[PDB]
């Protein structure tokens, strides 16, 4: 079905399940069906020139893929496969950086219909990572393949 | 010649950036125009039995900075990554490695252009491999070698 895990529990999962992610201090601000918002703290994630390291920005952009899948898709029937991800670093990322990712229920229905019928469906997430002033510091594009069990 | 002695270059590569240090990334070879790094599988696993995508990205991305440390005046210039594509080929199990190079001539062209114009771009197209030599991921990235601007300018 599409019943997401109880929120508070899902937040701990998102922030702690993967040690690599847990060590970065990544926090989940919102975990809803069709909408996730995460925050990567600047502290501890700085690079060699006073801004967020590219790998931390990548992690922030990558996580919504799995988080949004769990809150929006029927995980008992399908599973996601990430084919590739592209990051564009537009400006120095200073302070805490956030990202929002959306996929409405209608889109999920179309995708799962296709995945169910043909065995797989392709979809993507194009996100904007923003700083405290709302400026876009980086943009990501991730190509996913919805696969049926 | 070498812009930095080996142990110092290795220390900077593995520890200058805390995010990288925490991952346990190790430099196997660091020389002008050539670097080889290794990301341990232990501690970098995702929830499904293979290396987390973020660890793969870090391994694939760092060669840009490592080559900078071994090939250029690392006080006069600094590197930045502009854009990068990472393609996942198969679950990455065990320790994963990557190697990258810049020929002598390209190094000269880059420092000259960065010195005269303030910036110069260089790209890297790399393959990450597991202990059996299987290609687990492939990346393409654009970096910029930049000179420090004069404060107040």
UniProtKB/TrEMBL annotation, chain A:
InterPro entries: DUF4442, HotDog_dom_sf. SUPFAM superfamilies: Thioesterase/thiol ester dehydrase-isomerase. Pfam families: DUF4442. It comes from the Bacteria. This is DUF4442 domain-containing protein.
Automatic annotation (TrEMBL), chain B:
InterPro entries: DUF4442 (IPR027961), HotDog_dom_sf (IPR029069). CDD domains: PaaI_thioesterase (cd03443). It comes from the Bacteria. This is DUF4442 domain-containing protein. It comes from Pseudomonas aeruginosa (strain ATCC 15692 / DSM 22644 / CIP 104116 / JCM 14847 / LMG 12228 / 1C / PRS 101 / PAO1). Gene3D superfamilies: Hotdog Thioesterase (3.10.129.10).
